[PDB]
Subunit: 265 residues, 4 copies
């Protein structure tokens, strides 16, 4: 009654499902949710591609996995519980049947999983010490010795210019560094900081924000004082969204919206 | 500088997967060029080919069938745009240098398009039409929260802790959740503040970590109330780790090293 | 001289009947790249990416120039390396009227590492261009320890062992799964007795046909006298048996026998 | 017949890949059932995790969170449908048995649908409507040969040897040596004079000759002796033998220099 074979569903994911997760599904989540749940997750992953947003009835699921509906439901719940599945329901019209949305959520990364208190303990219980060790090493790579090693990596500003023309496995998000001397803040704060819009108001995130449009759009600090002071409210809101448009309109005052080009130095 | 006799290791703290290849080919390549795309792919191949081992730069020269100076030039764009971090080892005795080529995965698509700089450069190099196509490609439909309830079950809903004996494609950190009724917070707080430890010292980071430790280790609020006060930073904050470290020790002395086990409910 | 054939306003499409997978990407980077060079590798990557991005659609080579940040001469030079080495098939649309041309770029997957090393030319080229030490590391990387038959014996079940049909109401290589059926699913002794009486040379039933007969008999429950008929209905004056035609005859026979209900797979 | 303390090892000569997964999920799974899919998946995980190592079946039971009887029966389905080959070690002394689980990748989509039984079973299983979506999913639009003509270039067009100091399938990329690179008439002229049947040169041999001729710059009359050198009394030509003769011949001619691949 919570689920009827004639109820309808669609499978979506606002993220992608890849091969590093496949392994963490089979080797990490498996021990916790059991093997029938793994199949339920793999088939959903399949249905994702097999219907692009198209709608289906649960008979298809039953047919794809050669299983009866009750089993499917019990394992679904497990997938939900452990965070692999968000399940939504459409506003019910009229005299039934239901419409479902299955949002697929990729597993944790290996580092996040072992750093979770419960999941990591629960796992050691189910698999046993020896195996739990082998599993951890499998998802780990040798660490970097920062004693022997100095980072000489060049920055974004050393390689490029903007000119107008006519321990465990984890995903470390790549952040190019925009150095500092590309933009001077004390000079930016010369005719500014006395405004009682103080060093306090501007974040460290907004610091790097403006730093970017400076490089991108070729802004001298004197000019962006007037862009900041233009878009900031009496409430002392610093909004990234508007400040962008200030900078783009600014850039359109002369270069006509050609947009800058990335070039090497 | 960089000479052919110099040595290198290729390492990564992450794994490099299919949407990465598509992001790197369709998003990064228009900025850094193909010649650079080639080097990125080659280093990533080396990662697996040389398992932690050492190599003369003649290898790269041979595998790419390219000359050394070009290799240097393109590597700098990799370093520049944050696809590569390069470290060096200090020199003894007399020559040659040893390099650590650290590979970083690209941004996720949602991130790349949100970078205040990268998205702009791309649209210039690519042209407006192809840019929209690149955006739509890495996009999925957004979920309409107006028509859709979330009926998803929690972790505590489907599992229990029991003792034993001895639009843009993005990366979800997928968090299982624990219903707050798995712990009595009222009692914890109304017996607490008397030490001048506020409800301002409990972050959701702490608030959530309590829930887990409670659930996993079967800790009553009054005992947790004791642990909290134990390692609390004189600064009026809390270190989650130390708190965990306390309960790991607490569970021991109370139950005799007998471990938690995960079960269906 | 690329302008003699390719100009910027010429149009392309990218297609494949294959899917290019991770493994291919390593073979491309480690095996093919030393031979064809780094630039050709990027064009191949770009073409593979284009396969998904353009979805069956047209583009002008301007787009490729923009994606890779290079010019036509280079793209063209490398395109041809991909062609000669087997990585790309190129087709041209029959020209009407005159300008601009329409190219079909048909992507091909690399060889499997076993095929690559077992190739007369590619292996010796690769050794020379990469050196002896690196060559062995590549070979090993693409190899997996063999199976010792002396000490190991095959207990695998066949299809017929595990299933029944009922009416309803060394180098990395690609060894595809070949299920097998026990020759006991069908009585060939009787079957061939029938054919010999009808002057059908035993030679007519090839391994491929015998294999086909087996599957048909098992799937449809066809007795030997009845496959004698089916075979005799589809057989050449040359004594050749067309398996496609036999399959149809079998599919038809089943529709008469059980009334178009189709066979169902079940455990035994 | 299978007990928990029996040992296994997981091995493969292939590498199971992303497409392979979809086929297993959308084409095999309706035949073998979900549980067999998960055992297959698990075995693919173990292949990487135990690097050639040994385990007791306890590990299987623990990873899959399941008992031995089911593991057994689902294993049999994998064997029957062709996804798994099972070997045993001869038993010394007595108990436990050592198994080799050898993983075999799924049929590619074209081979699956072309198969008599699999397509007919899958069809009845999923219903005619879904069977079509499944067909289409594994399909790519064909190449119209009426409107398109191949301009592809061969190996010899692009490269040279020199001495130095529709259903988805696998179309194995076969580079083409357009055979003007070697005069076969000259080769067979004198070879027939030496009374070697033309039947002796199979396709495989002919291919090998062409490739060795181009790679080592071997003239027709020299290939003639080389082949005569390696042909046995049964008129079989061993390619590997012939490769050796051709390499040696190149060494003796150019002084152990090796061939290099270069633009033409």
């Amino acid at each position: 009654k919570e689920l009827i074979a004639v109820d309808r569903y669609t499978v979506q994911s606002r993220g992608v499902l890849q091969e590093v997760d496949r392994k963490v599904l089979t080797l990490l989540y498996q021990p916790l949710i059991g093997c029938r749940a793994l199949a339920l997750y793999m088939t959903l992953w399949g249905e994702l591609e097999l219907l692009d947003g198209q709608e289906a009835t649960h008979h298809r699921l039953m047919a794809l996995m050669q299983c009866g509906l009750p089993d499917i439901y019990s394992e679904r719940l497990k997938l939900e519980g452990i965070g692999l599945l968000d399940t939504y329901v459409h506003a019910k019209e009229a005299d039934e049947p239901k419409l479902f949305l299955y949002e697929l959520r990729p597993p944790l990364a290996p580092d996040q999983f072992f750093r979770d208190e419960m999941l990591s303990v629960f796992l050691r219980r189910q698999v046993g010490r020896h195996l739990f060790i082998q599993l951890s090493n499998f998802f780990a790579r040798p660490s970097i010795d920062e004693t022997k090693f100095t980072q000489v990596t060049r920055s974004f500003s050393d390689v490029f210019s903007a000119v107008p023309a006519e321990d465990h496995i984890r995903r470390d998000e790549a952040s190019y560094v925009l150095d500092d001397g590309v933009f001077d803040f004390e000079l930016f704060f010369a005719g500014l900081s006395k405004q009682l819009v103080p060093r306090r108001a501007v974040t460290a995130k907004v610091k790097e924000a403006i730093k970017k449009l400076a490089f991108l759009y070729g802004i001298p600090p004197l000019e962006m004082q007037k862009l900041v002071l233009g878009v900031i409210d009496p409430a002392y809101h610093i909004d990234i969204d508007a400040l962008r448009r200030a900078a783009r309109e600014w850039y359109e005052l002369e270069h006509g919206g050609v947009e800058p080009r990335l070039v090497e130095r």
